[PDB]
Write a protein that binds this ligand. Sequence first.
Ligand SMILES: CCCCC[C@H](O)/C=C/[C@@H]1[C@@H](C/C=C\CCCC(=O)O)[C@H]2CO[C@@H]1C2
Length: 167
Amino acid sequence: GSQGHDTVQPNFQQDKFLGRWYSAGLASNSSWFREKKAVLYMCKTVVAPSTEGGLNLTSTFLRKNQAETKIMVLQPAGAPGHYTYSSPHSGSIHSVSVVEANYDEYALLFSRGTKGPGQDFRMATLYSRTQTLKDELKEKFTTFSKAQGLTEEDIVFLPQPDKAIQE
Ligand SMILES: CCCCC[C@H](O)/C=C/[C@@H]1[C@@H](C/C=C\CCCC(=O)O)[C@H]2CO[C@@H]1C2
């Protein structure tokens, strides 16, 4: 048994976090998004400084089940472990918080969206800057998931891109 609503650890450092990253772990607290989460395998993800003085995470996946190519702009909001990025939904509204993240080790972020519609969807992204399995990151994210009420069908850990003939 376990419990927990959510929590963010202040003192975030984009200096040793911003940049290119490798897919390792992901999650989602949505019911409609999960139906699509099962079709998003490994790929490339890089976050660079936005032209508007912020952050821009560009995603890209070629071949293998599905080919993706998008980019979001994250802008800090008050606390260090709190930002927002115009996502898909007409008015593009999103919010993200750093539940932990370590220096030169790994980066973890939780993206939740709260809009009038009442979506109240959440997400957990794990970025590996080494391409290795971290016990702390694995345990911190996996466990933190319980507090975030993750979804077994929403979790995505560096899926195998053995999708052939999907050019
Ligand atoms: C609404 C916000 C969406 C943010 C998406 C995010 O910036 C992308 C993350 C990359 C994912 C693959 C990319 C796209 C999957 C799209 C699935 C879909 O068609 O809806 C996973 C592999 O590396 C990471 C985790």
